[model samples]
Target chain A: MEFRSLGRSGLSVSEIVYGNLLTPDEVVLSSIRAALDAGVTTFDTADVYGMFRSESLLGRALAGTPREELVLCTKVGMPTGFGPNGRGLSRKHVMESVDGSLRRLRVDHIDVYTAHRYDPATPLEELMWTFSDLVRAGKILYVGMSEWPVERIAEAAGIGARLGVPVICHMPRYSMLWRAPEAEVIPACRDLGIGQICYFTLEQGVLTGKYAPGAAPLMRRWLDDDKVLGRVERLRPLAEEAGLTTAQLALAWVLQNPGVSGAVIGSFNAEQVLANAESAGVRLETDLLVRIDEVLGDSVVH
Target chain B: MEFRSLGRSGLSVSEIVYGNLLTPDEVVLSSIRAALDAGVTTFDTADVYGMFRSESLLGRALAGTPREELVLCTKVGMPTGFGPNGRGLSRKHVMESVDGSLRRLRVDHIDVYTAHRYDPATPLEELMWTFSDLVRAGKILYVGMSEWPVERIAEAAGIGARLGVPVICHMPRYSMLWRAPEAEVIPACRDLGIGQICYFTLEQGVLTGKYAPGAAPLMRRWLDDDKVLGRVERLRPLAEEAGLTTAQLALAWVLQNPGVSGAVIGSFNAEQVLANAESAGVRLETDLLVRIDEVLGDSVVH
Candidate 1:
């Protein structure tokens, strides 16, 4: 397992983060333990997942593990209550959500308190200030954002610098098939000293090469795209040549980006966690990336 | 009591505020009681006053008073500790100061939490965000500042508007001899919809006409300058004709501006508090202001 510094911040996190947004409490407890078994130091969860019960499952599973050794990253800006103030990056919702997340997660302070996404309703200044306040109040150590527009991400990083709360990371969707971040987000974050701890690195497991080109549809978004699956299968040969699984290959490909800190991987079983951890330090060939991109061709998004 | 809404906000405040910074606990109790008698519902103090004991004095004095019926205004950005994070409007110092101010004031929420002055070291965004956060966290109601540059005041007001925490008032020094606000601060605040709850409204008691052209020294900044004292005496006749004391005339003069919310009078004795409160609701003639300005000619700042 490889641990990396979260951007330029003093805080460090595992390259393979255990994110449990898909499963609920019944099956989540063992998955968290398995992540710990794989030496996963960073756990990404949210309050709205499992209708706000996902944090409790993660908390209970990670309890009794000495806290300082691990990094607990949770998020706000989710609709936890059926009210006007229950969502958005407004100070009211952000502050209230942080308290609830801390309570559910049973932690004194979260390592990275991320905004789930860009809130068009709340001004960027408001969101940045809310994050700044949370950081200052000792409720969270760093500020992170997921899926904010390119400029909004830049502005947040600039504002955080003035507020003495450097935005350390951005959580985006990036995988072998998804290259949206490369053209803008990657360059912008690199210049701003922001690390990308991206999600869907396997494109919801499609990039893992388990599904055949004409196989039965799975419970995922990219399953029906046989053309995409065919390209994903083409990467398996290169992954094997590099001594890595297709999933590991996908994770490693995303990690190859200079600004990337970790890849958020959702695994239900111990074997998946172990395989995810193995992807941490596996370096790919220089032309291997070019060849992989050539195989995926039009399937990739830039 | 003449209650006026603070700026464009719906929060109403007494036109005469009880601000005790020159005296300590032993003398504050009775003065505060007298201020209540005079219907002065706004009390201003700070965390650094009397080495941070002044807030407790004001708190203990006003503890039993119904909170909602009054507006308790206090300040941060003062050096309350001997460390690096003790004074500036940075998030850390501001947060620490608010909690301390709340504990000392014996109140769950401060009506208007003001910045003691402009902090050059901390960025305006940091200061605005700190105030906005405090308002959302229910530690304070509105944001206020003292001695900030006019443009800084405008920027703060602008930022607060975007953050959903309006900058309600600015605490600047205003009086017959100090017309600096008129040239810039007054018009800027007026356009920004920020009220001037000004301090030193009597110019440290000099505008009250206590000293003659030639008299023994008094404990104030305006003393020893007989030329300035000579001009102050010229206003005594105009004040008497209005059926008010010189102190009341000075306070009334400041409140004549539409954007002026209240006169922060630091009264040591009950009689002075009563005299200050009597200054509210007294409208002055337009010609009267011109004539008074002519009398003080070069002594006025702007």
Candidate 2:
């Protein structure tokens, strides 16, 4: 139920934001309702999540919720189909993409809009001008980036500042399971005062502790591969000993980063969303963190 | 003394590969001499390492070491300056860059010449054609990439195969401290029968047990900031309690991966290199690995 500022945007966001990636239309409304009842007020989506279905579903679910009460953010740049201009941070793509996202989300203005990934081909000035135009036109209140490498992110932020189109936040994949952001992303953002909304805070449910070496975990990315599953087996005992669900342990771990503004959690069911929300505000002490590291021994991102 | 095939290049490489990144010319010569005396034969370098001084230093040091006794490798494509063509895998750059590397290394033919990074601006076809031309002309015997992502590396490999240029090896940063390759790169290489030469097996002296929370580590990379120093402090104890130096545990850990052919060790002193080589053969038992993981706890790509 607690709120924190969304990077430099100055908008208040829940410490745990909901993502509608896997949620069905029916589940989306119910989950959002339950989350609101629990004091959650931020929702994140993407033009590609569920092949564009999730945005409509999110729009429907948020219709009853006042627009001013929630901080809405989504992304562009990932491919939606096969084409030369189907993706990237180019002005044509960003201008066209935002209209589509606004229409899908049923919002005249999005609270936040982000470049999903670094587009090496696009000039930073072009991207900056596009976002600046959107903000000036009231299409998006703030601009940010997702899954961006540190060096590029820094460059974009610099361009944004110099060009007067400031990048408000950064969305990075950060959890106990993945910490690549610590290297340059988080530090650079902290130095620049750019907030980080950590995605995959539960590592696609791997940190939930429900999946064991031989036990069936809800089938997902690495679960389909036996080699990946074998690696997961190493951390089971550590999670069990902590008197916490693997999800709680993992979520708590990410919150340890001072640069993290909030964690974005994706869920398909209300129960799961509620459980994830409870993990907020709870801290993992140093000893427990050391034990978790011992269990998850190998650096997954190396 | 032993040799493993260099990636898929059809060339054999020594188990011990000399790294001449920051060593003084005297130390470089002495280390190459010692490695040769110990029956080691492969040497790795990059144009950016020590700003091309590494290649020149290694070239001078290798004078007493026979060219036939050494399998030399060098990399290009990392940005050297502000020029657009200063870096990339473009045909023009590759053709020019390798000649420069050869000149600095004093080698008429490099055993392995690699693109240090992928350049989105350059087409894969162009990269392959240039590399193919070099191999056909006997300018380089093999090709490699350093720390490239899985999908891009695979794409390059496929291009090389199609164009009749073999991508013989990959030199990626790998160690107990950095395990990114394990999740994707290692598995992909294993599937494709590619060779791996892992670097950073010691996590830039963090794994050497030399960097304490309050103590200084000689690795210049860590001393660059307080946050890095804090991370090293977090990883120190488990390295100590495991009855192994951080260097020993980390080096052994990388070798444990079945896909790894050899490790490129970096040390300012010959004694450190010798110490690391001893760790090269330490086989970590399953129980010990578990303990090591517990100690490392959780680290992002450092």
Candidate 3:
């Protein structure tokens, strides 16, 4: 039930944010209703979540809801079309993508508009200029980037500073199992005054410790796949000792890091949401931290 | 400095264990000396480490030390020779493996012996019998399994029990980044009364939040061809807010788990080892835990 500011932005995000990934339309709507009743205000969607099915599903769920009460957020820049111009941060794509997201979201404007990933082929000036245009047009109230490299984010902030277009927030993946952002991007964001929202609170279900060496692989669909199976085998024991479901422990562990502003969560069912929310309650004690350090002994990080 | 009984067996194991993945001659001696100086007595090694080079390094490191003062453990079943039957849990390989490990380790007896992996091609009974023979011969004091399914572990344990051999400890990759064991394996061990010695405490350094999207991937070398760079971009924010290093936060998070008997520590250099050792001291508080949960919203896990 705890809430925190989304970076320096005015938006308030819940300790557990929800996303629409694998739910059917009805389930998504019900989940939205339940989450709202459960005090979850921030909703994450994308032009590409469920291949746009997520946006439509979310829009349909919010049909009778008050717009002012929602903190609606979504991202663009992932390709929806075949052309190079269709996906990059070019003025054309940004302008076009914002309109498409608006149409799909059934909203007059997006509260937080984010670039889903760093666009390599496009120059920073072009992307910043395009974002600037969207802000001026009022299609997006705040500009953010998701999963961009630290350097590119710096370049975007520099461009934004010169042009007066502030990059407001960032979205990235974080969990007990994956923490690649701490090296520099987090420090850069803090220096730049950008808020952060991390996705993938859990490492799939790996953090849950459901799969064992002899047990049937948790995901029947992924069971035959050796790579997925191998990963499950590799990460189990630590999660178990934590007395955390891999999902809860992973979420809780992510919650321990400081640079985060809001975490974007994806859920297909109510149980998933409930379990993830519980991470906010379980603090990572000292004994568990020492145990983790020992588990990863002096192996070359190949 | 604390020690716990190894599973149902009364053999007390140091709460902290040593990892020998990158055991260079000088580094190995320094680490062993430092750990021993700090009151750590148990060490975990594997034939797979350095393709047999680690055993020799460990051997030389332990040459001047009293063998009885250490709990010597090493794994078999890695590709030791170039043949289809070169590895796995078969009797022939197990027998050959122990002698090779013992010879290289310069130890007459091993405190704990384990099957590196379960060979599905061979019957579980064969592995149990092979290990039982070793136990009866006083070559190994305890039997264990690694990265095996719960059923396989249970089967191995049951067989060991019938043959008056005890399956005492389990070694699995346990870390905050990867927590696949919680679902079933750890609980199974708890029920069966086997202590767990966890490996990969750092999740291949991903928990440190060290890799950048624009930079070359650090884990790509340790992992197979397919990459797990799935959602790492999300954790950047939370790492900054904690006012701790990402690696320290991660190490602390793992130590928070209650079920872990000991976490095996891996370090590249003495400084890294000492720093990692100190990570055991940080106790993650409740507010930080909540902040992390907020940024890691539950959108992708379920």
Candidate 4:
């Protein structure tokens, strides 16, 4: 697998990251091992995912692995309890959550500690300074944001720049069919020297050429509807022309963007992980990209 | 006129605030005089309003008004130039903007300093700490927010409480035709002990009962739409039943909420100011409120 820098920061990771947010507790370890064995080092989870059990599970799975070699990522700001302080990026919550995340992730330092979503309840100053303290305190190596508006990312980047812990990257929803971030989020992040490690790269197994729309309509999550599937299916012909599968074409489509450094894939098993990892080095040409866009037509969000 | 505490803070303000953002430079002084005569001591303006001339005009008008008795509020965090540092609640912008406002408002100490809008680019720590510094330095008496989402207000309030300079009030658009804030913003601020001093209290003159839907429709701002006017005119019967005008009825509707500490009205002339300020002491009955809601029906935003 190939790698790229996270924004302008020196940190690099495999172009394919293993998203662990929805990894069922029953098979979490084996899935993680599959990703690791396939040369995927960056693993993404969050404190509130699986009711705080996901990080704990990921920690146990990554146990005894090369700690130095891993770029472990997890997020905060999701509510995990019943109190006012249970969530948000307030000093109280961020401070409390960091300690808990560290224990569950089994890492002394989180390679990339992200704000899972913009906490409208938390002031940007409170969020930024708290992250500064975490970086200064050696709890987190760098900062990132996921699913935040462009202006928030820009502001955080500015504060982080002055404070010496830059907001290094963003994990956005990006795929052939999920280009919502491109029009606004991607451009701002690129100018601020923040890179994108987007999720939904495989569009929930649809881009893998694995699922055909059954008789039912609106069968699943986004990019899975038959109307969008109709456009996604159109990618298969383009993929064959480029010596790549439709899955790799989708992954490369997001990675090919100037702002994207990686695309996250939440694979369920070892073979899926191994197969998806090969999308890392594939590159789609300009002509193919134009035709791909033409094929998707109005199905794309941008 | 009635007076109340701004949130849990000891700061007290008139129940009616004179909103000076849209005040024409020509009639500004007369308007201020009218509001002052009407026992309105709280005046709201912003740094960027009227292309940065409104505050200066207001300063000339309130030139010799008793500083201690006046609750002079002006907001920051709006773009004033073509540079990157021109906007947002960053250390650079806030610091620069505060100095500019002090000069234009001709005040040794502003009674209330507000964030005109939430700046996603600035961190909460930066914003809260900066306000603390401003408070401690005696440049401002209290902090406020205008048009900010509920969560940002909560976070700022929480941070300010810890720092001992509470976010005391919010300025939102609340009226008979626009009860949007009632659903989310009002309830949150009420529990946080933050007060609402809402704008658009007159619904841009439509709720004043001074206009009938002529052949020309949508001739003005919100609430001026003919469709909305149809429902607004319905408030006239309810207003007369309660010994009020539609404007007073609209103002009272907002003031009647538990969270409402004040209602900001941007009256163009002395007559409008004197007329609208009467809303302060009026109280609407529950049955009338129910009837008013039924009359407006879907015309209301909430």
Best by TM-score, which number? 1
Worst 10 residues of 3 chain A by lDDT: A293-302
Quality of model 4 by C-alpha lDDT: 0.79
* lDDT (tens digit, per residue) of candidate 4 on B1-302: 78766675535578889988653466887888899889887888998888678889888888886454567789888888669998888988888888888999998667678898998988999989998787655577678898998889989988887765657788887887777887899889988878888877776667777776672122265534447767777778888888888888888888888788889988778897897888887877899989988988877777
- Whichever of 3 and 4 has more lDDT, that candidate is 4
Instruction: Write one digit per residue (lDDT tens) for candidate 3, span A135-157.
Output: 76677887789888898988988
For B160-269, candidate 1 gives per-residue lDDT tens digits of: 88878878889887887777888888888888888889888877667878877656133254654447878878888988888988889899998988879998888788
Candidate 1 residue pairs that clash: none
If ranked by TM-score, best first, what sequence of candidates would result?
A: 1, 4, 2, 3
* Tens digits of lDDT, candidate 3, B1-302: 55556776535566667777743478677876676666566777888888888888778777866554677789888888879778887888888888888998897778788788888988978888887677645567677788898998888878776655667788877765456777788889988878788887766765555665445143554344223333333455555566656665666665565556677876656656655655544567878666644543432121
Question: Could you give candidate 2's per-residue lDDT for residues B132-196 as a string of tens digits?
Answer: 78765556756788878788888988886555455757888887766777788888987765788
Q: Evaluate residue A94 in candidate 1 and report its C-alpha lDDT on the 0 to 100 scale.
A: 87
Clashes of each: 0, 18, 69, 11
Candidate 3 off by > 4 Å: A214-244, A295-302, B1-302
Sequence-dependent TM-score of model 4: 0.53
lDDT per residue as tens, model 4, A180-268:
88788988998998888888777666667666566212227553444776667777888989887788788877888878888898777
**RMSD per prediction, one decimal?**
12.9, 23.3, 30.6, 17.7
Q: Kindly report the TM-score of the first chain in candidate 3.
A: 0.84
Off by over 4 Å in 1: A1-138, A141-302, B213-225
